[PDB]
Amino acid sequence: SKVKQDMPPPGGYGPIDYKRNLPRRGLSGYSMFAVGIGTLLFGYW
Amino acid sequence: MELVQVLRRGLQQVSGHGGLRGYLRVLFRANDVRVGTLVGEDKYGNKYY
Amino acid sequence: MFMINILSLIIPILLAVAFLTLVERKVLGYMQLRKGPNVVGPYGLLQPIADALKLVTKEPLRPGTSSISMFIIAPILGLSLALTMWVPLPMPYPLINMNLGVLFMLAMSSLAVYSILWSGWASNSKYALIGALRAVAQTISYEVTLAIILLSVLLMNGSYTLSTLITTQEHIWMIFTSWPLAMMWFISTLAETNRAPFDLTEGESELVSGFNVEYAAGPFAMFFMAEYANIIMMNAFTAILFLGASHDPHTPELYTINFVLKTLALTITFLWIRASYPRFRYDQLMHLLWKSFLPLTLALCMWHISLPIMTASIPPQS
Amino acid sequence: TYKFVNMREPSMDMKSVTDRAAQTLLWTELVRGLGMTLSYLFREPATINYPFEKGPLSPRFRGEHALRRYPSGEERCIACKLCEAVCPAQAITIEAEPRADGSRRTTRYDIDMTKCIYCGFCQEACPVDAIVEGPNFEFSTETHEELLYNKEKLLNNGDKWEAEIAANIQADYLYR
Amino acid sequence: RGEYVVAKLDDLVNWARRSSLWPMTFGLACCAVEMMHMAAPRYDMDRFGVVFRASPRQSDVMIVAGTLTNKMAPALRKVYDQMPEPRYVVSMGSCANGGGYYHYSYSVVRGCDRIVPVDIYVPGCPPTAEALLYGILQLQRKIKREKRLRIWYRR
Amino acid sequence: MNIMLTLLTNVTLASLLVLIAFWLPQLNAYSEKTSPYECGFDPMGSARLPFSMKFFLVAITFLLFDLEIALLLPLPWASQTNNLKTMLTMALFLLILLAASLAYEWTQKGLEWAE
Ligand SMILES: CCCCCCCCCCCCCCCCCC(=O)OC[C@H](COP(=O)([O-])OCC[N+](C)(C)C)OC(=O)CCCCCCCCCCCCCCCCC
Ligand code: SF4
Ligand code: SF4
Ligand code: SF4
C-alpha cells in the first residue's frame, strides 16, 4: 500500500481572490445635483 | 409564483408535522418547524433528523 | 368618553414601545447574521413581557448619595412628557386640536432635557454629572436646528396646526419640496433622542451607560419607555411633516394605516442607522451641528421665506 | 516587496470635486453602509438551534476524561504514572499497589478538572490508551466539588462513553 | 389552597427571570473570547433573551471568564456586591474554577469561589462556546426550580 | 378642560408606574451594594469636577440663538401682510444677523473645543 496523507489535488487548488473588491456604483455628482434640483423645482411648482 | 411555493412549503411544514397540534408542539418545544428525514430513534425516545 | 380616548391613546403607545424593543433586537440580529429573540414565546413575541416582568421584580438600587425627590421626579417628568407628545398628533383627528400643535411639541420636547439634567445631578457620583452636561449641551444645540427647520417647513403650511399638514400635502409630499431640510431634520431627530452615532450619553463602549448607571430595574425601565416613546413619536412627527398621507374623511382608517406604516418604516430606519455606523465623538457631533447644519439651515430658512413670496404661493393662515 | 495603503492623491478637476461634494452633501457612502446592512438582513443567519442542533466537532476533540478497559473488562491502566509525570497542571494524582491477583493497578486516580488545562498530554503519554479525553463537553456542575474526579468517577465515565470513545480512537489512531 | 396561587406566581416570576438573564461581561483572559463566540452568530446568546448588558446595575448574572489574580479580586468582589438581586455567578474555565494552569502561583487566587458564591462551574480550558451555552441553560433550569414564594408561604 | 385632564392622566400614570417600579421588588441592601459605581473601585469626589468655559459658552450661545429663534417664530403669520417687501426685508435682516453672529463666533475661535 502507498502512503496517504492530506495532499493538494493533482492539479492544485483553484485561484483564491485576496485583492480588495469594492465596486464602483452610482451616478456622477452632476446627475445627483441635477436630480435634486429638479425634484425641488417640481415640488415648488 | 415563487412566493406561492414559499407559502406552500410553510403549509407543508404544518402538514409535515402531523397537523396543527403537532406543528405547535415542535414550534414550542424546539422553536423550529423544519421537516427533516428521520434517521433513527434511540431507546430513550429521542428522534434524530 | 374622552377619558377612554386618552387611555386608548396611552396604553397602545406603551405596548408599541414594549414590542419596539423586540423589533429593534430582531432587526439588529438579522443585520448581524444572527436571529435575536426567538425562544421566549413564538418568534420572541413574549420577550418584552419577560423583560418588563423581570425588571419590576428586580431590586431598584438607589444611590446613597441621591436626592430621591428629583431621583423619582426625573422619570415621572420623562414619561409624562413622552406620553403627552402624542395628544396633538393628527392620526387623522387629534386627541387635542390646537392652533399651535407643533409649537407645543417643541416646548414639551425642550422640557424633556430636564430629566437628564436632574437625573445626572441627583445620581451624584461626580462623573455621571459630566455625561449629563454633555447630553444637555447636545440636546439644546440640536433644538436650534429642530426649531429653525420646523419654522422653514411650516412656511408652506401657513400655521402651526398639525391638521393643516394633511391639507398642505394633499397632492404632493412635503419631502419633494424640502428634502434637504428633511435630511437635516431627520438627523437632528436622531441626535435629540440620543440615538445612533449620537448616543453619547449612553455610550455602551464610552461611559458604559452614562446618566443611567445608577438607575436600575423600575426607574430604568420607565426611562427606557420614555426614550422609545420619544423615538416612535419623533418618527410619527417626521412622517406627518414630510410624508403626508392621503386622507378620506369618510374612511380615516386608510389614513391611519398609511401613517402607521410610514411611522414604522421611519422607526425601522432609526434602528437601521444603529446597525450601520460608528459613533460620533462629542466634539465631532457638536461641530457637525454648529458648523455644518446651522449655516445650511439658516440659508434654507431664508430660501423658504423668500420662495412663497416670489412665487405667489403663500398658503392660507386659516 | 511592499505596498502603500494610503498613498493616493484625490483628483482635483471639476468632475471629481463635484463627485466629492455630492458625496459630502448627499451622504452616499453612508447609503452604501445602509445597503450593506440591508443586504445582510436578507441573508439566512448562521445561528444553529442549540441544543437541538450542535456545533460540529472532530474525533480529536478533547473533552471529559475517562479510564478505559480491555474487551475482557480488565482495566488498561497499569499505573506507570506517565500521565501524572507529564501533566502540565499537576492535575493527576495517582497511588498504586499490587492487586490481590498480583496486577499492577491504581488505588487512587484523581483528576482535578479545575486544575486541568485539557491539553491531552495524558492520553499522549499513556502507553496503553488507558486515560483519554472523551467527546463530552456538557458536564458543568453546580458545585466546585463535583469537578474533582475520582477513580470510580473516571471509570464510570469510561463505561458511559466507551462506545463512542472507541469509535473516535479507531477514527484517529492511525494519525498517532 | 392558597399555595397554588403562590406556586403559580413563583413560576411566573422565575420564568420572567430566566427568560431575561442579562449577564455582565467579565472577560479576564482566554475564556473571554469563547464567550463572545457564544455571543457570535453561530450560537447567538441573544436568541435566548440573554442580552449584551452593561454596568452591574442592570445585570442578573456574573460570568467569571478567565484567571482571577490577587491584584484583581477586590474589583471583582466590588462589582459583585454592586449587582442588584437576584444575582448569580457562573465560573467559566479552569482558572476561574480552581486556579487551573496557574493554581500554584503566588499571584493567582485559586478559584473565584473564594471571592464570590458561584452557581455554575463550567469546565474546560477554555470551555467551548457550546459548553458555556450549556452552562447558561443549566443556570436557567436552576432558576426554574427556585421556590422563593413557596418558602415564604410556609414561614 | 380636556388638555388638563390629559396632562393629569399622563402625570398620574407615570407616577403610578414609579410607585409600582420603586416599591414592588423585594429588597436586601447592605453598605457595599449601594456604593457608587466606578468599574470595580470607589469614586473620588474631588472638588467641583464639572468645569471648563466651553460647556458654559455653548449654553450661552444656544441661549442667544434661541432668543433670535423666538424672534423668528411669528414668521408664518408675518407672510400674510399686504406690506410683504418690508416683512421680507426684516425677516432676511434677522437671518443675516443670525448668520453674522454665527460667523463672528466661528472666526473668533468661539465654537472650537480647544486644548
Ligand atoms: C432651485 C433650488 C434652490 C434650493 C437648493 C437647496 C440645496 C440643494 C443642495 C443641498 C444638498 C444638501 C442638503 C443638506 C445635507 C446635509 C448637510 C451636511 O452638512 O451634510 C454633510 C455633513 C458633514 O459631512 P462631512 O463631515 O463630510 O463634512 C464636514 C465639513 N468638511 C467637509 C469641511 C469636513 O454630514 C452629515 O450631516 C452626516 C450625517 C450623519 C448621519 C447619516 C444618516 C444616514 C441615513 C440618512 C437617511 C435619510 C435621511 C432622511 C430620511 C427621511 C426624512 C423625512
Ligand atoms: S489534559 Fe493535560 S492538564 Fe488535563 S489531566 Fe491530562 S495532562 Fe493534565
Ligand atoms: S492512565 Fe496510562 S499513563 Fe496514566 S498511570 Fe495509567 S497507564 Fe500510566
Ligand atoms: S481556563 Fe484556560 S482558556 Fe480560560 S482563562 Fe484560564 S487559561 Fe485561559
From Swiss-Prot, chain F:
Catalytic activity: a ubiquinone + NADH + 5 H(+)(in) = a ubiquinol + NAD(+) + 4 H(+)(out)
Cellular compartments annotated: Mitochondrion inner membrane
Gene Ontology CC entries for this record: mitochondrial inner membrane; respiratory chain complex I
GO biological process per UniProt: mitochondrial electron transport, NADH to ubiquinone
Annotated Gene3D superfamilies: NADH:ubiquinone/plastoquinone oxidoreductase, chain 3
UniProt EC number: 7.1.1.2
Function summary: Core subunit of the mitochondrial membrane respiratory chain NADH dehydrogenase (Complex I) which catalyzes electron transfer from NADH through the respiratory chain, using ubiquinone as an electron acceptor. Essential for the catalytic activity of complex I.
UniProt name for this protein: NADH-ubiquinone oxidoreductase chain 3
